[PDB]
Design an enzyme around this catalytic site. Structure first.
Site, PDB file in Angstrom:
ATOM      1  N   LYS A 124       9.251  -6.321   2.170  1.00 61.29           N
ATOM      2  CA  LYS A 124       8.424  -5.141   2.417  1.00 61.29           C
ATOM      3  C   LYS A 124       6.981  -5.618   2.527  1.00 61.29           C
ATOM      4  O   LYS A 124       6.311  -5.810   1.514  1.00 61.29           O
ATOM      5  CB  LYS A 124       8.550  -4.162   1.247  1.00 61.29           C
ATOM      6  CG  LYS A 124       8.698  -2.699   1.641  1.00 61.29           C
ATOM      7  CD  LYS A 124       7.438  -2.151   2.279  1.00 61.29           C
ATOM      8  CE  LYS A 124       6.314  -2.045   1.266  1.00 61.29           C
ATOM      9  NZ  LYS A 124       5.023  -1.706   1.916  1.00 61.29           N
ATOM     10  N   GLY A 146       0.632  -8.039  -6.117  1.00 63.53           N
ATOM     11  CA  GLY A 146      -0.353  -7.015  -5.815  1.00 63.53           C
ATOM     12  C   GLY A 146      -1.152  -6.592  -7.034  1.00 63.53           C
ATOM     13  O   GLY A 146      -1.618  -7.440  -7.800  1.00 63.53           O
ATOM     14  N   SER A 147      -1.304  -5.281  -7.210  1.00 67.67           N
ATOM     15  CA  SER A 147      -2.052  -4.722  -8.335  1.00 67.67           C
ATOM     16  C   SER A 147      -1.225  -4.628  -9.616  1.00 67.67           C
ATOM     17  O   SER A 147       0.007  -4.562  -9.575  1.00 67.67           O
ATOM     18  CB  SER A 147      -2.584  -3.331  -7.978  1.00 67.67           C
ATOM     19  OG  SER A 147      -1.522  -2.428  -7.739  1.00 67.67           O
ATOM     20  N   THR A 148      -1.924  -4.613 -10.750  1.00 68.08           N
ATOM     21  CA  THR A 148      -1.292  -4.505 -12.058  1.00 68.08           C
ATOM     22  C   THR A 148      -0.635  -3.131 -12.209  1.00 68.08           C
ATOM     23  O   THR A 148       0.450  -3.015 -12.778  1.00 68.08           O
ATOM     24  CB  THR A 148      -2.320  -4.765 -13.211  1.00 68.08           C
ATOM     25  OG1 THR A 148      -2.636  -6.164 -13.268  1.00 68.08           O
ATOM     26  CG2 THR A 148      -1.759  -4.339 -14.557  1.00 68.08           C
ATOM     27  N   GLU A 149      -1.267  -2.108 -11.639  1.00 63.34           N
ATOM     28  CA  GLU A 149      -0.755  -0.739 -11.702  1.00 63.34           C
ATOM     29  C   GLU A 149       0.646  -0.635 -11.098  1.00 63.34           C
ATOM     30  O   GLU A 149       1.565  -0.119 -11.732  1.00 63.34           O
ATOM     31  CB  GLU A 149      -1.703   0.217 -10.966  1.00 63.34           C
ATOM     32  CG  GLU A 149      -3.131   0.230 -11.503  1.00 63.34           C
ATOM     33  CD  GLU A 149      -4.131   0.894 -10.552  1.00 63.34           C
ATOM     34  OE1 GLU A 149      -3.747   1.827  -9.800  1.00 63.34           O
ATOM     35  OE2 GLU A 149      -5.311   0.478 -10.572  1.00 63.34           O
ATOM     36  N   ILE A 150       0.802  -1.126  -9.873  1.00 61.68           N
ATOM     37  CA  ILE A 150       2.093  -1.083  -9.190  1.00 61.68           C
ATOM     38  C   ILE A 150       3.100  -1.997  -9.874  1.00 61.68           C
ATOM     39  O   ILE A 150       4.293  -1.703  -9.901  1.00 61.68           O
ATOM     40  CB  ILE A 150       1.957  -1.450  -7.699  1.00 61.68           C
ATOM     41  CG1 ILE A 150       1.045  -0.439  -7.000  1.00 61.68           C
ATOM     42  CG2 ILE A 150       3.320  -1.471  -7.027  1.00 61.68           C
ATOM     43  CD1 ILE A 150       1.483   1.005  -7.175  1.00 61.68           C
ATOM     44  N   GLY A 151       2.612  -3.099 -10.436  1.00 62.98           N
ATOM     45  CA  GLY A 151       3.480  -4.016 -11.149  1.00 62.98           C
ATOM     46  C   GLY A 151       4.222  -3.276 -12.250  1.00 62.98           C
ATOM     47  O   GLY A 151       5.411  -3.506 -12.466  1.00 62.98           O
ATOM     48  N   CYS A 198      -6.457 -13.378  -5.567  1.00 62.26           N
ATOM     49  CA  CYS A 198      -5.945 -13.015  -6.890  1.00 62.26           C
ATOM     50  C   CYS A 198      -6.563 -13.859  -8.009  1.00 62.26           C
ATOM     51  O   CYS A 198      -6.859 -13.357  -9.094  1.00 62.26           O
ATOM     52  CB  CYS A 198      -4.410 -13.153  -6.930  1.00 62.26           C
ATOM     53  SG  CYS A 198      -3.722 -14.789  -6.460  1.00 62.26           S
ATOM     54  N   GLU A 241     -11.117  -6.115 -11.662  1.00 60.17           N
ATOM     55  CA  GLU A 241     -11.033  -6.956 -10.471  1.00 60.17           C
ATOM     56  C   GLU A 241     -11.621  -6.205  -9.274  1.00 60.17           C
ATOM     57  O   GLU A 241     -11.113  -5.148  -8.869  1.00 60.17           O
ATOM     58  CB  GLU A 241      -9.579  -7.349 -10.193  1.00 60.17           C
ATOM     59  CG  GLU A 241      -9.389  -8.199  -8.936  1.00 60.17           C
ATOM     60  CD  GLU A 241      -8.007  -8.843  -8.851  1.00 60.17           C
ATOM     61  OE1 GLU A 241      -6.989  -8.109  -8.860  1.00 60.17           O
ATOM     62  OE2 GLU A 241      -7.948 -10.091  -8.768  1.00 60.17           O
TER      63      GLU A 241
HETATM   64 MG   LIG Z   1      -2.157   0.411  -3.946  1.00 60.75          MG
END
Ligand SMILES: [Mg+2]
Ligand SMILES: NC(=O)C1=CN([C@@H]2O[C@H](COP(=O)(O)OP(=O)(O)OC[C@H]3O[C@@H](n4cnc5c(N)ncnc54)[C@H](O)[C@@H]3O)[C@@H](O)[C@H]2O)C=CC1
Ligand SMILES: [Mg+2]
Ligand SMILES: [Mg+2]
Ligand SMILES: [Mg+2]
Ligand code: NA
Ligand code: NA
Ligand code: NA
Ligand code: NA
Lengths: 494, 494, 494, 494
Positions: free
Chosen positions: B186, B239-244, B296, B393
């Site tokens: 993806k 990617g981002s920590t949020e999506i992680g 990153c 970041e």
């Molecule tokens: Mg995003």
């Protein structure tokens, strides 16, 4: 906090160890072992020869037969025994340290705190390796299932020196036993006592008969019999470069047995201008004088940068002068006697040669005592690469200090040798330490330290200093025979 | 030797890649991909969603069935295919680099000499691992033959970011394919072009249908569909920590699929007083401004020792001001535009926050061009740990310079963070480098350098910067499912 | 050879273990632990909760601080301590075995000969790993020196079940301690006693305070507090698939801590027509009924080829009927009671379920005694894949026997499950064994045997049976945090 | 499918290869290489001697100097070169195969489909190893950072046989170059042509001058010069057991260079009564007759169980009689001529010895053609262990069939030999397969197959069949010199 020693320990073992039993030499002959501190005979020891080695090899081979207790034993159980042996050695730690000092000459304090400690750590390290040296499942091409079995090399002959009697035995037995091999050990005629007693503990620990067989005696006799034996699968030797040649030739002339060698050296200890003076001086002293200078990786070539040469030499001379020499059983003694009269005379000969070739004698240079084989801590200054004392392994309390200018220069001079066992680098600079450690052609390169051994880290030499590695995981390679098994399968899938 | 760039390369691929065929979204819907340097729409791309992901997974699962061409294929042949893919990527190097610059915004020279070179080196490195990740034969207790099979984890869902479209795609495919897995990738909605073209090369390389499937689309739709899919065995995200957090939660809520994350960071770059001034300055500049600061492991926390703070800052400001910003296809341009408007506004927001929080703006701080998403190289001085720009970041050309006094101080301040992806130390002192490298809690600690990646060395973060490792041998672990096979034998022997 | 048990062992530990000291729950609350053989309360135990977990985590974090005794301790010493703990456990072997049987219900003979033996071997095996899990030196591109450090993951939260109290504790502590991590263990509310006593031995062994902390209590409280804790770096869990989901979700919603799971299963035991009948029957029985059927890898799906089906079933029924159920302290007892009332009812429910869905009840099917939670060895014949007793883990003495025709058929049926913990194949044919061992999607595939666990061989599941591996070298991976250090050097050379 | 061969390929290289340049022997002397199919001379080749070897060693040493292109080259690039060389060999595949057949005598179809394919696979396999043979970071005791560097062993002297000219060269170059060493190769006087052409491709590939040096010539001159050379660090040899002894002694007498040997064998092929008749017969035929019976691991001792002995022998005889002998360039030819007159006469002598000692001649036994060195496929039945043909390596198309009764018996008889290169077992029984593969004292044990080589699987012999292993990861050990670097650190932490 070292326990008070028995300055006259009783000897319980002085025969040949075969099948967990004590035997006299077939010839009934015996040889005397001397206490280097007094020059007096400690006791007689069975002089094993070819016929004796043949009895040992047969015992070992029998213990190695498929279906035998040693062969069927769980790898983990082999680890259990090694740990048991270590426990028994620790129980009799005080006694063994004294007996080591009595036969070798090294200070009792060092025997207890250093030698015996390293012995215990070595045996216990390898104990953990017993069931972890895995083989591999290989993703070979085609419809096949391929894998490797890490099997024991077989009957291993091990010939060890006299500088570290107990430690050398541990360095050999540890990896061999952990991998399921059987041993026929030939200990040095100068120091056979301690090894023989450990053999008693090997039996007590529970090791099957024939797994470990020790044959005390001379080199040209018992040692050569092992190296040339037709049923010895592998031989490990530690000693002179001269005998190492004999060993490899004997192996090639006999049954093409696998061989690993740990020979001498002339290890360079490089001291850069930015080095921590006080530290470098003390470490340089230890680097050479340790164990009466009788260390394979002894820093016998102290290269000092010009800008700090004078001060370094001054401090070194002072330290060498204050180095206490005397009875190894006295807690204040830093240096005991040399192993024997032969080494004693050879060291004095080298000192005499150092004088003749123009080396500046800074201190010592003669006999330290009337009784025993004691030599004064000798330091030679303004040594040149071409000098004998700068090329040949002295194996005594004789320090060589050389002066250099550039880092490129010291590299070339350090590497200009047939040896390559060890090397050291003292500096505060990152790039310098990394440049030298990579450039130096030596098995072990110490940075801001010296003689730092660990059962976890491999030890061996480059060039004519030997082949193969001991200690660490690498120490198992030479004691393993790899078998590839490739099976046909209906249909291979990832 | 950089070839003339086609400043408007033709787009050949813009659909969903399933079973080596191009498909439109089941919904027929599409989304625009914008050129960050102009703000104009490059072309439309099929908007893949759950239904599209379901098709890709089924295709992958089928290609992974026991007995299929991909499963039966020799491990070495898997390597040949990866090498072929590499060769094809090199053939169309010039084109890919240009298309990369067009969709991402990074300078063409960089896309060619850096990004594409690394992509080639990554695929070629892992190609060599294809038939070398051995299983083990274990010396288990009792009469058994125990061994492990290193099998593919299965259907691997891979969700990658937009900062390094081509490279992130290689970092994922290389290890996955080398170990015989199937992929449902993806790609980022901001940069889907290049990845889709590689899919064409994958098909041309000879890879069986279903082995690699690419589904372009948005995160909450396509991405979440993968992370929550009941038939996806493993998922790797970057990617981002949020999506992680969302990914890991989805995995636990669905079928408990294996997970590995590569999140953001706030990597500290420690400049000791004894560092090489000129070198440290240029590297610190590179450490943060590289790839428009969209890295990153960006050194967004430049710690400088007080004794050299003033000079370092002066030099840094000068370099920042001289950093050429403009059209990425121009050979003189060092910094292109940000990936998109969202990031563009987010970065400017942080700059405004940096000013309101007391940070001293030394240079830049505003939009660098009327058209596109360009931002001036911004540098903040006298930054304090508690400041927003020192914790969050930014992912932009915003440099933070902090002052410190002692080595113990910097270690504590550097480690005081929820991130731990990377860190750096600049010094000429051996002990200082070794002390900091061991004390710093980060996945990678560079010494006298920064952003030094090698397919041979593992990369990943500590704490909330992620879990697991990519690149090197370690990169194969997450893509391997271990099976133990213990067989009863007549009589076990060493 | 089994020492007479103390049927009513004294309880010396029933509180929370933190910093090598015993504490009451901050709430001062306690919960009763029941003896499944009598249904009577053994004693009360401190009911740990979130506040108690916070205390433990803080203690562990403090013990893990850089420069602490646990961090500075030599890796070899870590192994020494593990070896000591094992020796202490063996010293108190008879006691622990009885206490294990008292709280769990399993036969005292089994507790002594199997459980405790496996505990000793696990701790001893991992003791040997302490100083052998090496990092790497990588030949990275350019003028650099790259290497990896294998550091501890940190504060490890371990949640264990009740089916193997002592053993589950060893499987967790062994690898964690060997790698230098700190632990906060949450033992099962049904069997907390043995683990607590072991904590006493941990202190006695010399382990620094905070290295191992045990918090007895319930799941939704103490367990969840660990899984959601912001300062726990990694969590290992063993239990139900449902709780496993909750754990991974809690990890993703909190600090993204690393997670490894060991869940249930519905392991298939395939008996081919050419198998050794007498051996397969006895092993198939053991595979299912072992530990009151409370085994994660229990062979709950016994596939038997049609040509031998009738005979196999007839013999299995007889063996099941002869299985002695009763007081676990009696030497004649083969099967003790279930762990608790909850499991007792759950199994009875599944039995009724099997009857309702058409499964043929061949023997047993009801309560085995008036007092306690004893269930009759139950066997279901002519079971079909769609039946619930064929899909869900019963975790009781309920055997399912299914019939099959071809080898291709059984592979598909055995793999048609969300579970994949283990599997077995009974056959004399080389090709059949290899074909099946490769085809079966299970973490462990036993050939002509079952429940063969070796500390050397990894254990874990595929699919929803878990992620990650325990035991063997693989068991160290989840407890290791990899750090890459890339140093710039003057000139890199091979 | 096989491309039409040029039955008379043009020779482009016939001189000594040093520093990527072609040189004539210092003595200007040349030796003729003969086509075994006709007995006529193909062309003259530079007869290298000691003086030519010295030039080669110096060239290699120079190319091995620190800071040289070969030493500074990135490990990954080393793999790139090996991959390139492989691509060049594939381009000139048709030509090389023809030239191989012309000089060796083996069928063109075989040289193309087998020899060259294996050569390509070997070089590409090791290509991937170039940057993956990691060193270790060791957790040694005390405040130190210890790690190992895996450096090249140095100037490697490689002496290869004539049975597989191109393949033997590949087996030697692949591992040596992958690890960064330099080579001084001495090909067989009987087959020097193909090796020399490859040297041309090595230059074309981009390999630095001196990296690979090929010196064609005789054994006692050129070969002995390499083995006894004072500047050769390691020597790898493949050939007779007799010369192996000479090489080992020469190494011990000179500079104690590291040695690895691959000698002959008398490999046992055990066919159990439950084996697949058709398969066993065809595989046994292949096992011995492959490459004109000139294979080190040839199954020269076909053990067949009495119950199936008669039928097996009958089928084997028919197969041997149908084996087409003739022009190696004809697609129908299965067996070409022997390598030279010496071997031709040696084999004819063994056949005579077989008749004299009572072995039953079942077919063949004489010259197969009037021109060339062709021998009829010979099969001896009712062979006894004490017969010469049952003990000595014939290295020709002479099959020995021996009868046995029990599995215990065949194990002892099979292992009763000074050789231990390989062995095989044909059986459908799982237990027997595992029992024998474990019991057989051989480097490679094949089950239900023979001569299954894989670049991924190690190959080497037990006992007097050699030492060390080639291929797979193990093949890198002999070409690596391990250096330990122990750095003192402020405070060591886990
Ligand atoms: Mg995003
Ligand atoms: N690498 C080291 O740590 C050691 C180095 N050396 C060096 O060798 C010099 C001479 O001391 P040595 O005691 O003569 O060392 P050496 O190498 O000659 O003797 C050591 C061991 O080999 C045995 N040996 C002697 N001749 C043998 C032979 N022909 N075949 C097989 N084994 C034989 C000896 O009996 C003893 O067991 C020392 O001054 C020092 O330069 C000596 C001992 C150890
Ligand atoms: Mg001597
Ligand atoms: Mg529950
Ligand atoms: Mg010859
Ligand atoms: Na003595
Ligand atoms: Na875009
Ligand atoms: Na209980
Ligand atoms: Na020829």
């Amino acid at each position: 906090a070292v326990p008070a020693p028995n300055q006259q320990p009783e000897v319980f073992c002085n025969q040949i160890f075969i099948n967990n039993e004590w035997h006299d030499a077939v010839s009934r002959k015996t040889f005397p072992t001397v206490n280097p501190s007094t020059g007096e005979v400690i006791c007689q020891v069975a002089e094993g020869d070819k016929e004796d080695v043949d009895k040992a090899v047969k015992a070992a081979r029998a213990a190695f037969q498929l279906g035998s207790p040693w062969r069927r034993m769980d790898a983990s159980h082999r680890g259990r025994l090694l740990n048991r042996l270590a426990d028994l050695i620790e129980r009799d730690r005080t006694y063994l340290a004294a007996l080591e000092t009595l036969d070798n000459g090294k200070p009792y304090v060092i025997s207890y705190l250093v030698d015996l400690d390293m012995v215990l750590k070595c045996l216990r390290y390898y104990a953990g390796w017993a069931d972890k040296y895995h083989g591999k499942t290989i993703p070979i091409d085609g419809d096949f299932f391929s894998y490797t079995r890490h099997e024991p090399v077989g009957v291993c002959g091990q010939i060890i020196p006299w500088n570290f009697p107990l430690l050398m035995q541990a360095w050999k037995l540890g990896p061999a036993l952990a991998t399921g091999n059987v041993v026929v050990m030939k200990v040095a005629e100068q120091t056979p006592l301690t090894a023989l007693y450990v053999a008693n503990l090997i039996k007590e620990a529970g090791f099957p008969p024939g797994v470990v067989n020790i044959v005390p005696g001379f080199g040209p006799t018992a040692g050569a019999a092992i190296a040339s034996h037709e049923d010895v699968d592998k031989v490990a030797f530690t000693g002179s470069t001269e005998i190492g040649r004999v060993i490899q030739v004997a192996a090639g002339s006999s049954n093409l047995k696998r061989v690993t060698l740990e020979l001498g050296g002339k290890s360079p200890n490089i001291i850069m201008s930015d080095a921590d003076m006080d530290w470098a001086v003390e470490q340089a002293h230890f680097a050479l004088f340790f164990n009466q200078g009788q260390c394979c990786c002894a820093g016998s070539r102290t290269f000092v940068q010009e800008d700090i040469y004078d001060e370094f030499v001054e401090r070194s001379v002072a330290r060498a002068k204050s180095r206490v020499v005397g009875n190894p059983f006295d807690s204040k003694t830093e240096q005991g006697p040399q192993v024997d009269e032969t080494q004693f005379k050879k060291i004095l000969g080298y000192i005499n040669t150092g004088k003749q070739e123009g080396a500046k004698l800074l201190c010592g240079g003669g006999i330290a005592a009337d009784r025993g084989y004691f030599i004064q801590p000798t330091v030679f200054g303004d040594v040149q690469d071409g000098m004998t004392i700068a090329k040949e392994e002295i194996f005594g309390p004789v320090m060589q200090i050389l002066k250099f200018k550039t880092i490129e220069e010291v590299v070339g001079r350090a590497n200009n040798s047939t040896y390559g066992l060890a090397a050291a680098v003292f500096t505060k600079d990152l790039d310098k330490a990394n440049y030298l450690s990579q450039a130096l052609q030596a098995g072990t390169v110490w940075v801001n330290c010296y003689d730092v051994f660990g059962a976890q880290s491999p030890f061996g030499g480059y060039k004519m200093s030997g082949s193969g590695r001991e200690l660490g995981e690498y120490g198992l390679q030479a004691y393993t025979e790899v078998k590839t098994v490739t099976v046909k399968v209906p249909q291979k899938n990832s």
